[PDB]
């Protein structure tokens, strides 16, 4: 009741692993590749890379479409590392799969109110480089913080706003 699942008698699957800054560099190029070849990257846990061909969108040439992808992928991994040293393992199969959507559930903290609205509008009308604030936060900071007025903006009425310069040292 939480999974929509569809059988595919034949698709093509690719797993890669290479296998902080370095990882993200490669993977961007792989993502670009996936988009170039018009293929589908599947989210998987723990640093391994997975691309599918023929799913969700069937392709008469699904295996070879993937094979071509794999060949580019090695040519990118090839160079493009740390010192002079990228070790990429890549695996391909073609056969039946099941594909579809998993209905997981998450729990997040969230906040609502006028303060959220006021904060939103303070950001989106802020002057670049500044921290913009209403009267209410000004009142709370004036003693310990130094602030300079901006003036009266229409906030989707009319409010006075201040820039927050810094602490008082």
Residue numbers in the entry: 240 to 258, 273 to 333, 335 to 339, 341 to 411, 414 to 426
Sentences from the paper on this structure:
Rv1625c is one of 16 adenylyl cyclases encoded in the genome of Mycobacterium tuberculosis. Adenylyl cyclases convert ATP to cyclic AMP, and these enzymes are classified into six types based on their sequence similarity. In solution Rv1625c exists predominantly as a monomer, with a small amount of dimer. It has been shown previously that the monomer is active and the dimeric fraction is inactive.
Rv1625c-Wt crystallized as a domain-swapped dimer. Two subunits (A and B) were obtained in the asymmetric unit with extensive domain swapping. Clear electron density is observed for residues 240–426 of chain A (except for the β1–α2, α3–β4 and β7–β8 loops) and for residues 240–428 of chain B (except for the β1–α2 and β7–β8 loops). In general small regions are involved in domain swapping, but in this case about half of the residues (β5–α4–β6–α5–β7–β8) are swapped between the subunits, leading to a large number of interactions between the subunits. The dimer has a head-to-head arrangement instead of the head-to-tail arrangement which is seen in the case of dimeric active ACs or GCs. The intact substrate-binding pockets at the active dimer interface are not formed in the swapped dimer. Metal ions and the substrate analogue cordycepin added during crystallization were not seen in the structure because of the altered domain arrangement that is not conducive for binding ligands. In the case of Rv1625c-Wt the dimerization-arm loop (β4–β5 loop) opened up and exchanges the part of the molecule consisting of the β5–α4–β6–α5–β7–β8 structural elements with the other subunit. Consequently, a new open interface is formed between the α2 helices of each subunit. A sulfate ion found in the new open interface neutralizes the positive charge present at the interface, interacting with the arginine side chains from both subunits.
